[PDB]
Amino acid sequence: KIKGTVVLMPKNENLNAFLGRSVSLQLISATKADAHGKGKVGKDTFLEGINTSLPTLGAGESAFNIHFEWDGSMGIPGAFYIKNYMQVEFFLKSLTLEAITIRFVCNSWVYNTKLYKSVRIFFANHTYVPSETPAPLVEYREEELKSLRGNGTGERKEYDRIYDYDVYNDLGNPDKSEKLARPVLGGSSTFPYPRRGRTGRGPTVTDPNTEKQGEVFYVPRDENLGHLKSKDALEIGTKSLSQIVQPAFESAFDLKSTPIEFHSFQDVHDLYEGGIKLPRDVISTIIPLPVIKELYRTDGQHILKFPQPHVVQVSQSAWMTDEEFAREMIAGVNPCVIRGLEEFPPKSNLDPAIYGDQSSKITADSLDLDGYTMDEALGSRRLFMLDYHDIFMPYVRQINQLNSAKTYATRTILFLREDGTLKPVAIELSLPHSAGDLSAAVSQVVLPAKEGVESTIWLLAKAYVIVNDSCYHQLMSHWLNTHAAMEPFVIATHRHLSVLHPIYKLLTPHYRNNMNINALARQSLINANGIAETTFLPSKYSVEMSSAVYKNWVFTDQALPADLIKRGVAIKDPSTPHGVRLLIEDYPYAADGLEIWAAIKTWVQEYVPLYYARDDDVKNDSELQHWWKEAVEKGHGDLKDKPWWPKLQTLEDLVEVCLIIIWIASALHAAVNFGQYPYGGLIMNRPTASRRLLPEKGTPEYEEMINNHEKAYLRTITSKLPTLISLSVIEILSTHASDEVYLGQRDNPHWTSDSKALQAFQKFGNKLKEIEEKLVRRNNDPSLQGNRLGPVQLPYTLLYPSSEEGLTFRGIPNSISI
Ligand SMILES: [Fe+3]
């Protein structure tokens, strides 16, 4: 008999109930086949007893002894079937067979046997490209992929493990109201979009093209991550905020229990000092809710107190400095949009027949470039911009028609000073113009000012820019480029790469929780009248704006060197270690990012050749070829006609594709995600909406800018009630769960039996530790203070690879996990 140990976790996170005839396992041979060439299968073997011997056992886990009859005619086990005859599902961790050691890493929920169309199968931890699969496992390997793909029909159930694609046709709620109808995103030239995971709930009764509402948005079962500690279930907080907390806040405002608007900046600071007083029944709603109860300190009676945002921990006024406004474009929440400006004035590609004359109104001789002429600044590569003009202009008219929204399409010009810091030198606030226009508001240029009403107008100009930047950050840099862009690759990977496949093992840690958070976001974040639409400027146009931006999304430009070169913030330079020379030498995001990028590249370049010796080996891997074909032609199918997709016929193409996927999922998402509350937890620093244009001279609103500048500012930016909701959301999303798995870590040390792959992975984790030491030295270097810390004195730690749990402003998860 072969001695085995099963480790599992009961659903409650009673052990005698697993004995008797409750759980059967059957070993499957990798070497002895039946007459059809399929590995022979052993007898049903039941769990025999509880193993209390090994002190090495994670929380919630139990170990069971089992002995398998396995004679000569059976060969070597390479897989097993398991049947759960119990009513309730359990979480299967592993099987370990001794003195034959063979390890099986399972980490999968096993529901009652009657719920499955075919018996659950698990493979030992060996790694095989398809031409290396032992012959008696070839059919089992392919049948398991066929099972995962399903047939493209049916309402998906909680226990299903079926991966497939669908369009974003589940955000509208047209059965509730015509006002809640939304365009389908994906599957048309008007609205191209990445695909998402298919749920199959079926059509609404009013629109056959929109998917009906559902209490639970399915994800394949093992994508729905359980947590030992309920506080770690951060993705569910989004749902609780929308469904329970937001209505409670709304009630406090409807009943006039708290002022409707902030009246001074101190009313905003109060949120993390003394707190806000709210009705008792409002506090009583929050206090018992998992995740939500961690967001606020409370007296249990009437007070909620938000945590002090990092950006104010040293100076509560530094966010208002021009130095910090520009520094955040290279070391802030959204450090990836600034571009070099190589001509002046800046140009627009938009049609003047639609929007009016698009010539810039910024004059060169009005700009203070520290004594440089414009030609000198351009030539020395010292001029940059944050350009939202062409991005926002197409939507300004329809946004400004909404009752409580008004924006400009902004452009900010920045100068790289000789001291190496950026300074803002002008903001252009543009509006579309057409013959029939009812509005008399005009475009204007605003220049820096420190005194008088001109200083208030300049501070407001910065707020209009940061509203554009916050909307672009959240919808494009963050949602579109990480969450949404990655999901098609998750789906393709499970559909086409076996668990046995080396590239499955390389990529899947980088998908942890991504389908789950995305489904929860379709339900409560980006749904019609959901949190994003009611907190961000574009309202009901928000998600469709991300579709318009996706028209220009380029997979190969997500690589960090290509991004930097495309934006004109670095140049190709083969004499440099990273192959690019930064044009802003101390650009903290890019400088730290290049280190992480290089480490991932080395890991991928070391792992790939362990499994692929020539370009032909890549061409000849049928799972890999099917995977990439489907990811492109189905998952990102609206961009299938584009010439820039890698072909995947060479080793270098495989490395490139894997490298870009891991970068997007880990460091890029971390850099755009974990600064959300640290920088945006002060709404004045990261306003999410603007509600009025600049006032005309001779009006009470203009006199208010002179006499009460803080009120003028607060009336312009996000109102108090959506601010309380936005702050709560971003606090959740900026938190690391205690069970996170970070870059350089895996959830199990035995993910492969291949020692060379294990060694290469250890080298990768060591290199990340080395890199963190280097980044600490950078933050401690007084010469780099201006960009790495700024007047907010906030060291740039967002690309430190490691972190403890909580709202830490550091740490790079493997995946898009929140
Ligand atoms: Fe995120």
Query: Distance of alpha carbon 238 from its chain centroid, rounded?
Result: 14
673, 685, 787, 814: the catalytic one is 673
818 annotated as belonging to a binding site for a ligand:
yes
CA trace torsion 434, 436, 437, 440 (10° rounding): 100
Q: How many residues does the chain have?
A: 818
β-strand partners of 303: 277
Nearest of 394, 398, 434, 392 to residue 411 by alpha carbon: 392
Residues 447 and 530 in one domain: no
Instruction: Classify 100 as helix, strand or coil.
Output: coil
- 134 Cα–ligand 1 center, Å: 40
β-strand partners of 28: 41, 79
> Residue 211: phi, psi to the nearest 5?
-80, 135
Nearest of 525, 560, 573 to residue 669 by alpha carbon: 560
User: How far, in Å, are 282, 529, 719 from residue 255 at the CA level?
Assistant: 12, 22, 17
Query: Distance of alpha carbon 635 from its chain centroid, rounded?
Result: 17
Nearest of 493, 470, 473 to residue 481 by alpha carbon: 473
> Residue 469: phi, psi to the nearest 5?
-65, -35
Residues 590 and 715 in one domain: yes
| Omega of the bond leading into 782 within 30 degrees of 0 (cis) | no
Residues 454 and 490 in one domain: no
Choose one of 411, 441, 469: the last residue of a domain.
Answer: 469
What's the CATH number where 199 sits? 4.10.375.10
HSE, side-chain direction, 13 A CA sphere, residue 272: 21
Residues 737 and 788 in one domain: yes
Residue 439, Cβ neighbours under 10 Å: how many?
13
Choose one of 421, 438, 469: the last residue of a domain.
Answer: 469
CA geometry: angle 213, 218, 224, nearest 5 deg: 140
Structure tokens at 386: 């944050």
User: How far, in Å, are 321, 396, 432, 656, 709 from residue 461 at the CA level?
Assistant: 13, 16, 17, 41, 13
Give the chain's count of helices (H) and strands (E): 27, 22
Residues 311 and 368 in one domain: no
Gap between the Cα atoms of 78 and 31, Å rounded: 8
433 assigned to active site? no
Residues 539 and 487 in one domain: yes
Instruction: Classify 338 as helix, strand or coil.
Output: coil
Q: Are 625 and 648 in contact (CB under 8 A)?
A: yes
Gap between the Cα atoms of 792 and 318, Å rounded: 5
Nearest of 110, 98, 107, 11 to residue 53 by alpha carbon: 98
Residue 255, Cβ neighbours under 10 Å: how many?
10
Residues 489 and 415 in one domain: no
The domain containing residue 71 runs over which residues?
3-146
Q: Are 478 and 673 in contact (CB under 8 A)?
A: yes
- 561 Cα–ligand 1 center, Å: 22
Structure tokens at 31: 């070497």
Gap between the Cα atoms of 809 and 682, Å rounded: 15
Q: What is the resolution of this structure in A?
A: 1.4
Gap between the Cα atoms of 78 and 75, Å rounded: 9
What's the CATH number where 94 sits? 2.60.60.20
The β-bridge relationship of strands 297-298 and 276-277 is unpaired
Longest dimension (CA), the chain: 97
Residue 491, Cβ neighbours under 10 Å: how many?
27
CA trace torsion 672, 673, 675, 676 (10° rounding): 110
Gap between the Cα atoms of 670 and 811, Å rounded: 7
Gap between the Cα atoms of 603 and 658, Å rounded: 10
What's the CATH number where 614 sits? 1.20.245.10
Instruction: Classify 654 as helix, strand or coil.
Output: helix
> Residue 400: phi, psi to the nearest 5?
-70, -15
Find the helix or strand (DSSP H, E) in which 31 lies.
strand 23-33
Nearest of 495, 480, 457, 614 to residue 553 by alpha carbon: 480
Find the helix or strand (DSSP H, E) in which 410 lies.
strand 409-416
User: How far, in Å, are 6, 301, 522 from residue 166 at the CA level?
Assistant: 37, 46, 13
Q: How many domains does the chain have?
A: 5
Q: b/e map of 57-85 (b: 16 or more CB within 10 Å)?
A: eeeeebbbebebebeeebbbbbbbbbbbe
Nearest of 475, 559, 803, 533 to residue 670 by alpha carbon: 803
HSE, side-chain direction, 13 A CA sphere, residue 227: 17
β-strand partners of 197: 165
Find the helix or strand (DSSP H, E) in which 27 lies.
strand 23-33
β-strand partners of 104: 95
> Residue 26: phi, psi to the nearest 5?
-135, 120
Gap between the Cα atoms of 253 and 246, Å rounded: 11
HSE, side-chain direction, 13 A CA sphere, residue 679: 32
Gap between the Cα atoms of 467 and 168, Å rounded: 26
- 417 Cα–ligand 1 center, Å: 33
Q: What is the DSSP letter of 695?
A: P
Q: Are 537 and 471 in contact (CB under 8 A)?
A: yes
Gap between the Cα atoms of 316 and 269, Å rounded: 8
Find the helix or strand (DSSP H, E) in which 33 lies.
strand 23-33
Structure tokens at 186: 């994906």
User: How far, in Å, are 32, 232, 386 from residue 222 at the CA level?
Assistant: 31, 17, 41
636 assigned to active site? no
Find the helix or strand (DSSP H, E) in which 624 lies.
helix 622-630
478 annotated as belonging to a binding site for a ligand:
yes
> Residue 807: phi, psi to the nearest 5?
-100, 80
What's the alpha-carbon Rg for the chain, to the nearest Å?
A: 28
Residues contacting residue 630 through CB under 8 Å, at least 6 positions apart: 492, 495, 496
Q: Are 766 and 716 in contact (CB under 8 A)?
A: no
Instruction: Classify 206 as helix, strand or coil.
Output: coil
Nearest of 422, 781, 418, 775 to residue 569 by alpha carbon: 422
User: How far, in Å, are 132, 680, 685, 772, 814 from residue 467 at the CA level?
Assistant: 54, 11, 10, 33, 30
- 544 Cα–ligand 1 center, Å: 19
What's the CATH number where 399 sits? 3.10.450.60
The β-bridge relationship of strands 297-298 and 196-197 is unpaired
Residues 141 and 229 in one domain: no
Gap between the Cα atoms of 276 and 306, Å rounded: 9
310, 389, 483, 496: the catalytic one is 483
Q: In 664-699, which ranges are continuous DSSP H helix?
A: 669-673, 676-680
552 annotated as belonging to a binding site for a ligand:
no
User: How far, in Å, are 605, 640, 802 from residue 769 at the CA level?
Assistant: 19, 39, 8
Per DSSP, the residues of 665-712 read IIIIHHHHHTTHHHHHTSTTTS---B---PPPTTSHHHHHHHH-HHHH
CA trace torsion 389, 395, 397, 401 (10° rounding): -130
Residue 466, Cβ neighbours under 10 Å: how many?
27
Q: Are 110 and 137 in contact (CB under 8 A)?
A: no
Nearest of 496, 479, 455, 476 to residue 551 by alpha carbon: 476
Experiment type:
X-ray
433 annotated as belonging to a binding site for a ligand:
no
* HEC sequence for 469-492: HHHHHHHHHHHHHHHHHHHHHHHH
Amino acid at 640: K
User: How far, in Å, are 81, 104, 126 from residue 33 at the CA level?
Assistant: 16, 21, 19
Residues 364 and 444 in one domain: yes
483 assigned to active site? yes
303 assigned to active site? no
Q: Are 195 and 491 in contact (CB under 8 A)?
A: yes
Structure tokens at 226: 């359980």
CA geometry: angle 166, 167, 173, nearest 5 deg: 115
Give the sign of the dihedral formed by CA 490, CA 494, CA 496, CA 498: positive
Residues 134 and 83 in one domain: yes
HSE, side-chain direction, 13 A CA sphere, residue 811: 23
483 annotated as belonging to a binding site for a ligand:
yes
Q: Are 39 and 136 in contact (CB under 8 A)?
A: yes
Gap between the Cα atoms of 429 and 392, Å rounded: 11
> Residue 738: phi, psi to the nearest 5?
-70, -15
Residues 589 and 675 in one domain: yes
Amino acid at 670: A
Amino acid at 646: P
Q: What is the DSSP letter of 635?
A: I
- 106 Cα–ligand 1 center, Å: 27
Gap between the Cα atoms of 424 and 460, Å rounded: 14
Nearest of 354, 372, 657, 332 to residue 493 by alpha carbon: 657
β-strand partners of 581: 571
Nearest of 673, 669, 664, 668 to residue 555 by alpha carbon: 664
Residues 92 and 173 in one domain: no
Q: Are 330 and 589 in contact (CB under 8 A)?
A: yes
Structure tokens at 231: 């506080």
310 assigned to active site? no
Choose one of 311, 335, 359: the last residue of a domain.
Answer: 335
Per DSSP, the residues of 297-319 read EE-SSSEEEPPPPGGGSS-SSGG
- 711 Cα–ligand 1 center, Å: 32
Q: Are 64 and 6 in contact (CB under 8 A)?
A: yes
Directed axis angle between helix 588-607 and helix 322-331, to 10°?
10
Q: Are 424 and 398 in contact (CB under 8 A)?
A: no
β-strand partners of 80: 27, 122
